[model samples]
Structures are given as C-alpha cells and as structure tokens.
Target: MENFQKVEKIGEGTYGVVYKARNKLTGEVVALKKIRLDVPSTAIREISLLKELNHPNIVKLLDVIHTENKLYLVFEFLHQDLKKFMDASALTGIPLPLIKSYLFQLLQGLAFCHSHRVLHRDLKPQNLLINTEGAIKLADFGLARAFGVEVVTLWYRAPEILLGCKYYSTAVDIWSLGCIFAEMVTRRALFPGDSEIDQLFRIFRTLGTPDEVVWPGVTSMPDYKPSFPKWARQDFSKVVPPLDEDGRSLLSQMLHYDPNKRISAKAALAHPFFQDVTKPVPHLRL
Candidate 1:
C-alpha cells in the first residue's frame, strides 16, 4: 500500500480484501490483494505456483509487496469477470464466436497448468476475468484448494470432490470447465444445486448415475452412493441446446465421470470445437 493508491474495494474473500489500486509512481493500475498468513502452506503454494505459471489465459502476478507480517499480491488489472458477462448476456446469449474463443483460451490455460502438474481445483465464472477486447483470463489462484462464499455455488465442483474423493488430479479442473462451458452456452448454470447432495444429484440426474461399467472404481470410493436412485443419462445437447454437435461432444468428454476417461485440457484444445480459434487469443495478452 506504500506506492499504490487505493481506488476502491473490489472484493473480500476467504483470504483477503482486494482493492483496485494504482501505482503512484508508474501510473499502472492493478488488483492489490492484501492478506495475512492465515494458512502458511496455502499461501506459499499459491505464491510459488503462480510465480512459475506464465500463460496468456492465466492472470499475471505483477509484483509482491510485503509490509511486516502482511503481504500484498499485485496482479495486472482486468476489467470484468465472466460471471457479470454471463448475467449481462442473459437476454442475448454470448456470441458463438466469442464463447468459442473464451472456451478455447480456458482450455489452453488449463493445459499449461496440467502440464506443470498444478491443479487449479477452483475454476468458475467469477474466477475468470474478461477484458473489453473479448479476452478472458483465469484469476484467483490465491488458494486453489479453498473456496470463499457461494458466488460460484456448488454446481461447478466435480463429482470427485462432491463424492469425497480425496485423491484427484487435473481431471477435476476439467470437470469444472465442462460445467462452465455448458453455462456459457445456455447463459445459465448447468447444475444449479442448493446443497452438496443436490449438486451431486444434479450431475447424476443429467449425466446418469455411474455404474462400474462407466466408472470401474466409482462404487468402491468411500462416498459413492450405490443405493441412490438411478437416473438415465440425458443427451447433453438437449440440456445445453445452444451448442453444436462438436461442442456437445467436447463437453461430454470433459464432464465424464471416470477421471481417466475425462478429456485432458491439451486434448480438449485440439478438439474440433476449437477449430475457429486457432491460436492463443491475441487480445488476451497481459
């Protein structure tokens, strides 16, 4: 807070208060996140991991300012989040071309993180930032394994997390992307649930209750509900009617119950659904 002047309170989360601040000397605007070491391990993990992550779709950590026991993370300023965009596009859904580009960039960023063996563990509309130039970037890596309030709700959480699967990998992030991608198409949450049980039930109802045939090790999981009412899988395209055949195919792959079968971000970036967006979105440069 020394060199930067606070503009306004952007948000407050489980970790800290975020302020839209501007550098007094350099005239550079940034998101200044001030936090204390509530969880030392989590703090270290976020800082170390973000320092290593350099991708167009990932938010850039500009600088770290430390004052006594408090720490401030400076991030390159981004205009708006995808949550607001989704709401603004409520009446008129997002354009296919733009949605396609954002989805492509999301996968590209995820692929980079996965390749580095870093699981974001939290990917939702609010965590995704969008610039006026039609670019989207993934933000909020402060604590990947943690969550704040329910702006994202429980709908984006993967079945593994909901089912208490302690051992999971990047596939969990892919599952979240699947939900967000579906939302982008419909301009609505795909699995809007009131609670954890309802969230998992929403997923099972739409994608069908998993059997050993679909997910070999599912039933053995500690939290698997073998006795839960079985729900036949509905065609996802029917649920997210705005998407094309290829888009639906990609969504299904990402949302698959079996982590092994779930499509990797790298593979997803190569899918036909991203044909229109060939490379890193130039507008997303940050």
Candidate 2:
C-alpha cells in the first residue's frame, strides 16, 4: 500500500474503500481498493478472478500489494460509473442506439468471462465503469466467482439462486444483464423489491409467476414454496413505460423467467436492437 501515494478517498465499495492514488515509480493515476484482513477470502477471490480477466471492456488489475493486515489492489483510473451518469440527468433519456451499443459492449465483456468459466454474479449499473472516452468497462469483481459455484447477491441474483439450486453457471450473469437492460430503457429498476420474496413477486408480476410449464424444475428447488397468492398477469407496457416495440422485444428475451431460456450475452449482442451497430464500440478504441 505504501508503494503509491493516496490522493483522496473515491468512495466506499461493497468490500472495501476506494482511493485515487498515484504510483510513485510510474507516476500514473490509479484506483486503489483497500480490503480489510477480516475479509481475506473475499479479497483473494477478487484478486484471483481479476488476474485471469484480460479484456478491454473489463477493468484491468495493474498490481496487487499486501501488507501485514490488508490487501490493496491497484487498478486503472476511471471517471465514473453508469449509475452516476444516469442519475446526474445530464444525458436526459439514453438513446436506443446508445443503449444497444452499451449492451453489446457489456455482452462482449461477459462473453469473455463466460468463456473462461467465470460468473460476474453482481452486475448492477453501479459496477459498470464509463471512462472519459465513453467506453463501458465492467468493474468490481469482488462479487464475481468461477462458474459451478453457488453464490448469491440480492439484486442481480437469478431465479435458480432464489430456488436454492446448488450448482450454477454463466446463466446467472445473463440474468443480471437482463435486469441491467431493463434499467437502461426505463431509467428505473424493473423489479425494485425490498426483500427476496418481494423481488420474486415483482418479477412475477411482470413476467408472470413461474410454473411447471414455464420452469420445469420449479417444484424441486430447495426453497420451493407455492403458497404465495398468484397475482393477475400485468401488462409489460405498464411496467416498462414508453418501451418501443424493438426495445420491448429485446427486453423480453433477456428477462426470460427460465434460466435455460434466457438469451446468452453473445446472442443478445446480435439482437435486432443492435442491427445498426456497424462500428466497433467507441469505448474500446485505443
């Protein structure tokens, strides 16, 4: 940690505190993430996972320094995340083309992770970094883990997780991408429930309650419970106000209730919504 000079505290993160720092040797600006020793396992996971990822759309881990009681991760500095940009209200409404472009870049990043058998289990707008060049880089691998492991987080979790399925794969990340896509269009969360049960209900209200026909193994999941009163089917148009026909079509595919049926990140990039993505993502430009 002493290798770099801390400029200022950037923000608090899920697992640690972030700081803008400057490397004394190279004199380069970087973001330093300090993880307390009490969270050793999580720190190891974050570092190991990031070390394996080498993609333009994914944040690069420049170095790792460990002191007696803490781990400090050095990363390339980024301006801010999508959440801040969206909340600042400077962009007004995100254009459909730009949304498609961003989604394509996100999928590109996910494709690389999935190909390497990694799952970015938590993929909220806050975790997506947007640099000055308008490029979207996926950050915060603190919640990311290798595939075939059981891990869960509240907002981006998949139905399989809610069901207590033991083994999962890249499908979990796809579910997160769906939630993000909805947010990009509506400028709001599609399912903003306070608790797990409430989240399920919110999801069901929009996608209809999962049944044996819709989800074959719904009854066998570890947390399976059929007691919640079934709510009437709600119109998508009402839930996702002002979503154009093309946007709605893509959203439906991504937000599929069945994990098996959810569109893969790669396939989502090819969807009609991105038919006009004739050029490579601008953020990837060197």
Candidate 3:
C-alpha cells in the first residue's frame, strides 16, 4: 500500500483525484482514487459501501490505502466510458443486439446493487465504464448513498426528489436507468434540463403529467406544486424514433411514469428484448 508509484492523472472525480498507479508488489496497473477527507462521514460512507460491494458489473475496489490526510482506493483500470463510446461517430451505429447486451450487463450490475440495498443515485453514461473488450462496469460512488437516506443531485434523479419527497427509495435509480435506456437508443440524453424545475418539466412533457392518483402521495411532497397548461402525452414513436418495437417497449417499461410501476432491475433482465442475451450475461465476467 505504501509503495504505489503514481503514474499520471487519470481523471477528476466529484470528491477526489484519480490516477494511474503501479502496484509495487505485482507491478500491475490500477486506478488510484484519492478521496478528499473534508467530510469524514461522506468518506466513511463511500468506503463502507465499496467494501460491501463485489460484483463484476460494478467496478472492483481492489484495495484501500489510507493516509492521515487522505484515502487511496485502488480499482481495476478501464480504458473508456459509455459516454465516450456514444460520442464516437465510428461506434454510434451500434447494433441492437449489442445494445441489449450492454444494457443487460448494466441491469445485472444494478440488480446486484439493489439486492444489497445500495442506490447508485447517479446513473449516467459517463459513470458506466467500458474496457477495450466491450465489458461494462458502473463506477463512481461519490454520489451514491444508502437506500433510505435523503440525497439529491441531478441527471438520474426522480420526480419525487424534485417534488421534495425525502422518503423516496430505490425507485429513483430505476428512473435514471430509464433515462440511460433512452440515451442508448438515440445516442443523446433524453431529458437534458438546465435546472431541477426544467428537468421535471421536460420529463412531464414527454411522459405526460403525473397526478396524485397516478403517483400516490404526490400532494404531500415538500416541493409539490401544480404546473400550468398540461400537454397531451406524446407518441413514443416520435419521442424515440430510433428504437424498434421491442426496444421501445422495454424503454417504456423502465421509464414508467409511476416509480412503483417501473420494472425492477432483475425483472428487466428477464425482459423479452434480452431473450437471446447471454445467460449469466457473458460480459459480466470477472
């Protein structure tokens, strides 16, 4: 732990600096995540969460090197992320089966997390790591928190958060999964909003406005308020023009307006779209 030789800066994370490092004992390449200790409780939560997680779809936390002032986390190195992959023109025209394969692997990872009572709070293409072999792994737990805790950022956040419902649970993560699915099919963010209010409106515009009846307990949310001029629901055919019937069906299931109605990660794996996908999913190899 003391002899790791820092190679170069790899990336900047929300709470720390990530670098390429060489394990002195094995001389193997690994990513060294240096977490800032400005908030001791947050640091402890992150480490504890990572220690309890051991899944192929999620990034492997190999070792923890602690110093008086910082904590160094050694993780498996991945060459690129899903965000970068989607941006590359050469890779933009990805086949449907391959897309299903990647999503299956993602859900497999998510299923493991949810089973263990962890919510990846932040789910985005950039957080999805991919090696040269086309394997996908979810990374970055800085924004992730215990399932029952109240936390909010953006991106994959659910409507309950916008409505100030602090009691929300794992359902929020499913909403983000739906957003990621949309991005995969269109190769662009489905609900790109500049602010929380804007994001909520964007989602409402596409999915149809939710009422207290559809999304129970909506009126009690801390920030809940009525919005004007409700727009009619848009056809999925136009909103996600690129997806085929099966793909769109799965996408709709993931992005269901009712969080309670959203499909669980495990159920999503069993969806017909993944009927031919590898069982125990080939890409989730350790």
Q: lDDT of each model, Cα atoms only?
A: 0.82, 0.74, 0.75
lDDT by residue (190-227, candidate 3, tens digit) is 88887888888888898877776667766667886765
Q: What CA root-mean-square deviation does each model show from the true structure?
A: 3.2, 4.0, 4.0
Maximum-lDDT candidate: 1
lDDT for each residue of candidate 1 in 1-286, tens digit (9 for 90 to 100): 7799999987666677888999999999999988746445455555766777888889898886666656788998887888877787779777777888888888889999889888888788888998866678888763545323214478799888888888788999899999998998888799999898899898889999988999888888888866988999998768889698999999999989999999999999889887776333323222
The stretch of ten residues in a row with the least summed lDDT in candidate 3 is 144-153
What's the lDDT of the predicted structure labeled candidate 3? Answer: 0.75
The residue pairs that clash in candidate 2, if any, are 135-283
lDDT of 2 by residue, 1-286 (tens): 7678999987565466889999888889999988644435554665776776889999888877766866778888887778776676335666666677778888999988888777777788878888766578888763434221212336666778767877866787788887877787778877777778877777777777788887888877888788755666677687677877777787777777778888887887777877776333223221
**Candidate 2, lDDT over the whole model:** 0.74
Q: List the candidates' TM-scores in order.
A: 0.91, 0.87, 0.87
Model 2, residue 64: C-alpha shift (Å): 1.6
151: Cα error in model 2, Å: 17
After superposition, the stretches of candidate 2 with alpha carbons farther than 4 Å from their true spots are: 39-46, 142-153, 278-286
Pick the TM-score winner: 1
Any residue pairs clashing in model 1, and if so which? none
